[PDB]
Amino acid sequence: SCMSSIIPGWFSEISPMWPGEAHSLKVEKILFQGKSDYQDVIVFQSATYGKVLVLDGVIQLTERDECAYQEMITHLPLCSISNPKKVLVIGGGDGGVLREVARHSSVEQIDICEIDKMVVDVAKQYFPNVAVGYEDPRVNLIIGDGVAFLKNAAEGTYDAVIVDSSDPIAKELFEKPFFESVNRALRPGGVVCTQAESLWLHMDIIEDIVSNCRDIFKGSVNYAWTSVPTYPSGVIGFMLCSSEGPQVDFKKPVSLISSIKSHCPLKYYNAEIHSAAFCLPSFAKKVIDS
Amino acid sequence: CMSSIIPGWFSEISPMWPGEAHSLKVEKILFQGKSDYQDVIVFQSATYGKVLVLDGVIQLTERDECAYQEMITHLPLCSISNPKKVLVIGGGDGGVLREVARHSSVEQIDICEIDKMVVDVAKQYFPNVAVGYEDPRVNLIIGDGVAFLKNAAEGTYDAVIVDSSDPIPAKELFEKPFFESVNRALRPGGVVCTQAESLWLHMDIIEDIVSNCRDIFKGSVNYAWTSVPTYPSGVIGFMLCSSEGPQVDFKKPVSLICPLKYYNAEIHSAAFCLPSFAKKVIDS
């Protein structure tokens, strides 16, 4: 179904989470097809987006546009607070989020949970220039469930939690108890940033996500969005919430983001787009503002 | 262009976005003409309502057109005081006209659409938006806007909106002479807003439009972008250019404005905050 039976080497991203639409990509090579204990895993060499990671038929990243997601999900929370030291990432992807967290020189510890070792192994083999992400000596990789890991975490441990999840299908990561777990694992005024889907496609799912966060997190609660051409509807959003404690202002950065530089310039994130990301269209704005 | 990758699905293929296509499941085909100018399809889509297509390229869908039509219209029109005379190049489905008509200081809306079939299709298959054409201030010309514009009285217009297709004879709308034509027909400090493609797919083309624009318009020259799921890459952008004359600040609207679904003063400003890869190139 996802691979065209009509004309060779077209992949089409079909889902009932985005009914009646597919982003089709010309595929040169499948580099990897694989079935873990959790999910179907495909990597292809696309004609125009470089390498593409697909889990359960859903595009997770392309080399060409991953920067828009990976820089926004990392820098929106981490540039909003001073001197973040301890960070938790839920979901490993290709390591590109870890690479973004590691630009922040105040960070000392990056704990990351990925349930599926196949996803880690696939990152290291097929996406090695971004999967160096995993090798930063600050990084502590747990192959295990992130929901359990967070129940089990010491209270008040983290400056920041980044929830780099797939779609709510994964469904527990969008619910009140998981958020209560996050609230408890954050230091007072610690921040969470989560994958919060498409304003065009899932207004109903997002209204509930913001209601749960408004209830659990007593600091700040904001919603941001970014252009990601190879996500469905060409955009995805983020919950930014702070726990009870010091003032947090997600709307502007505190901080802009070594002799030997390990990173290229930011490709997408900057201090102006940080603010712009919180200016929603009128159809979305009405709802999310309460 | 129909069932080219999936049976029952429209796929938007073009060497303007190599290696990719947006695919929409088609409930039914509503129209199929071949005017003296382009191949015209309207189809009823599964989930984006009615869809207009010219030469295999998506012009609009009922579900997301608000994001294009409200931004190409209100970014220019909310950046100046009491616009009275307005020229639109391109008719689409009358959506842009409907949005221009929200501005109560506007007296005259000249619009050029070379292809009459586009207009007839709009009124027939998109009637609730095609009302844009019916408003008493609208002066509809079935003719070449390039020609209409070179034939205009110098300094006549407060604003021109270029709601063009892709730079594919449409390519004239992207070149110095047409830009000189506009700079001329605008009053001093008058503004133009142009369809200016995707920062993800067309940085080269955009760079050339900006540079061209910066030679001609001696007021402000700015680029803005917006989410449109059914345009290639999911975003489209706009040149905003003011002619020599009173200062225009496109990032800070001077005024506020069947309700608006997308545009608002906050998104007005955010529309000029480009990603770092675009922001460097587009600035100097």
Side-chain angles (χ1 to χ4, degrees):
Chain A
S1 201
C2 84
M3 294 285 296
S4 180
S5 81
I6 278 56
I7 196 151
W10 285 82
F11 169 79
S12 285
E13 183 198 42
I14 309 294
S15 179
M17 276 165 296
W18 38 99
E21 75 177 86
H23 199 162
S24 309
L25 291 168
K26 186 83 178 75
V27 160
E28 294 169 350
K29 290 286 162 212
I30 294 165
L31 301 174
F32 184 88
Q33 184 149 2
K35 185 206 147 68
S36 62
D37 296 335
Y38 304 86
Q39 56 201 337
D40 299 322
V41 180
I42 306 147
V43 179
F44 38 90
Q45 187 68 45
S46 76
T48 55
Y49 280 76
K51 284 178 276 166
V52 181
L53 176 60
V54 180
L55 303 175
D56 286 346
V58 183
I59 305 169
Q60 303 295 300
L61 57 84
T62 80
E63 300 191 283
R64 174 172 176 183
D65 61 9
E66 65 181 343
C67 60
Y69 183 79
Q70 291 174 350
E71 294 184 8
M72 299 294 280
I73 201 181
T74 293
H75 303 316
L76 284 183
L78 292 190
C79 300
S80 292
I81 51 155
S82 310
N83 201 31
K85 288 176 184 144
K86 215 179 147 169
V87 172
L88 176 65
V89 188
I90 294 165
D94 68 349
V97 167
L98 289 172
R99 193 103 170 95
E100 284 317 305
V101 172
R103 294 184 190 256
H104 295 262
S105 71
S106 59
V107 172
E108 291 177 22
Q109 233 170 293
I110 309 168
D111 301 327
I112 177 159
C113 294
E114 176 51 54
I115 202 161
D116 196 342
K117 167 159 139 64
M118 190 176 287
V119 163
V120 178
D121 294 325
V122 151
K124 292 197 167 134
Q125 267 115 81
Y126 296 97
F127 306 90
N129 289 167
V130 174
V132 290
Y134 287 103
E135 267 78 62
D136 183 295
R138 290 177 295 174
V139 167
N140 167 59
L141 175 52
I142 294 77
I143 317 274
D145 171 23
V147 170
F149 184 88
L150 260 165
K151 279 167 204 166
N152 265 300
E155 193 204 320
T157 297
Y158 289 108
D159 294 296
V161 172
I162 291 158
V163 181
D164 181 22
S165 75
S166 205
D167 301 313
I169 282 182
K171 164 79 181 290
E172 205 180 6
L173 296 165
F174 300 86
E175 317 284 8
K176 262 219 175 91
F178 176 69
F179 299 140
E180 191 40 87
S181 187
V182 174
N183 187 72
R184 239 178 46 76
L186 284 174
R187 78 163 166 72
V191 296
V192 58
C193 185
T194 82
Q195 195 271 97
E197 293 298 350
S198 170
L199 285 174
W200 287 107
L201 289 186
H202 323 116
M203 269 322 305
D204 284 314
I205 294 174
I206 289 162
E207 181 184 296
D208 294 339
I209 292 164
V210 178
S211 252
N212 299 344
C213 295
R214 275 180 202 301
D215 283 42
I216 301 303
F217 304 105
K218 301 305 170 201
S220 306
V221 176
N222 291 284
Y223 184 100
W225 70 325
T226 185
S227 170
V228 182
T230 55
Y231 289 157
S233 79
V235 295
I236 204 155
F238 313 104
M239 294 296 310
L240 284 293
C241 311
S242 72
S243 72
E244 198 188 333
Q247 280 197 17
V248 169
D249 182 17
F250 285 125
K251 298 290 222 230
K252 284 172 178 174
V254 304
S255 71
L256 309 193
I257 209 73
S258 248
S259 285
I260 307 169
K261 293 118 179 100
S262 36
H263 315 262
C264 309
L266 291 167
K267 300 173 62 187
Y268 192 95
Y269 178 84
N270 50 65
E272 271 195 325
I273 203 157
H274 182 134
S275 304
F278 290 98
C279 304
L280 299 200
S282 293
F283 76 77
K285 204 210 183 338
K286 316 205 180 74
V287 179
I288 290 157
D289 272 30
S290 197
Chain B
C1 79
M2 291 276 176
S3 296
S4 45
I5 305 169
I6 319 172
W9 290 64
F10 172 80
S11 283
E12 192 188 47
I13 314 198
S14 182
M16 274 261 288
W17 40 92
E20 73 165 296
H22 281 161
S23 297
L24 293 175
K25 190 147 146 39
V26 178
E27 191 186 293
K28 211 168 87 294
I29 300 218
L30 295 190
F31 185 76
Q32 292 207 62
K34 180 144 186 299
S35 85
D36 288 299
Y37 295 102
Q38 62 201 329
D39 302 325
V40 180
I41 310 163
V42 188
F43 62 91
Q44 175 65 53
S45 90
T47 44
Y48 279 79
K50 284 177 270 181
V51 178
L52 179 73
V53 183
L54 299 178
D55 279 1
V57 178
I58 296 163
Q59 297 309 293
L60 65 84
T61 87
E62 287 181 300
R63 175 171 183 187
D64 68 4
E65 66 186 334
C66 57
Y68 177 76
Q69 294 168 353
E70 287 172 15
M71 295 299 276
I72 199 173
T73 299
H74 304 312
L75 287 168
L77 286 195
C78 288
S79 298
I80 46 157
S81 293
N82 306 306
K84 311 180 196 253
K85 203 146 174 19
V86 182
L87 170 64
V88 188
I89 315 295
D93 68 352
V96 172
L97 292 183
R98 200 174 63 154
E99 295 302 314
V100 170
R102 281 175 202 280
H103 292 251
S104 72
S105 72
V106 167
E107 295 184 12
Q108 272 194 277
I109 318 167
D110 298 336
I111 185 279
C112 298
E113 176 51 32
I114 205 167
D115 185 350
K116 171 160 219 296
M117 175 165 298
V118 158
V119 190
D120 297 338
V121 148
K123 297 204 217 213
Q124 186 166 311
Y125 297 101
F126 298 90
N128 295 121
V129 190
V131 297
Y133 290 107
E134 289 344 298
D135 173 298
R137 290 177 287 183
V138 174
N139 174 54
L140 175 53
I141 303 103
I142 312 294
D144 187 32
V146 169
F148 184 91
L149 198 31
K150 200 179 158 296
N151 284 317
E154 176 167 326
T156 284
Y157 285 103
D158 296 299
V160 177
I161 292 154
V162 186
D163 174 20
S164 66
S165 209
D166 296 302
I168 284 299
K171 152 197 66 46
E172 282 178 26
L173 296 163
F174 293 91
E175 292 168 341
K176 307 285 226 109
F178 168 82
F179 289 160
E180 192 38 78
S181 210
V182 170
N183 183 68
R184 171 161 186 287
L186 277 176
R187 71 155 162 89
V191 299
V192 59
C193 188
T194 83
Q195 186 279 93
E197 292 296 354
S198 166
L199 291 171
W200 284 106
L201 304 175
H202 316 126
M203 273 316 306
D204 285 352
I205 294 175
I206 289 169
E207 200 170 323
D208 188 56
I209 296 154
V210 169
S211 160
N212 284 356
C213 268
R214 205 155 275 198
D215 296 339
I216 304 292
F217 305 99
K218 297 316 205 179
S220 320
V221 180
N222 294 278
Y223 191 90
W225 72 335
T226 194
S227 177
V228 196
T230 67
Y231 285 153
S233 76
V235 295
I236 190 105
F238 307 104
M239 295 303 310
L240 283 299
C241 303
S242 73
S243 74
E244 207 199 284
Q247 292 224 121
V248 172
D249 171 16
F250 287 114
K251 303 183 177 192
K252 288 173 136 40
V254 290
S255 80
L256 297 186
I257 190 92
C258 99
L260 285 169
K261 291 141 78 163
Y262 191 99
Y263 177 87
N264 61 63
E266 298 187 1
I267 225 196
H268 185 126
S269 298
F272 299 85
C273 302
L274 303 183
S276 286
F277 75 83
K279 177 213 204 333
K280 65 144 54 173
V281 174
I282 281 188
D283 284 356
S284 35

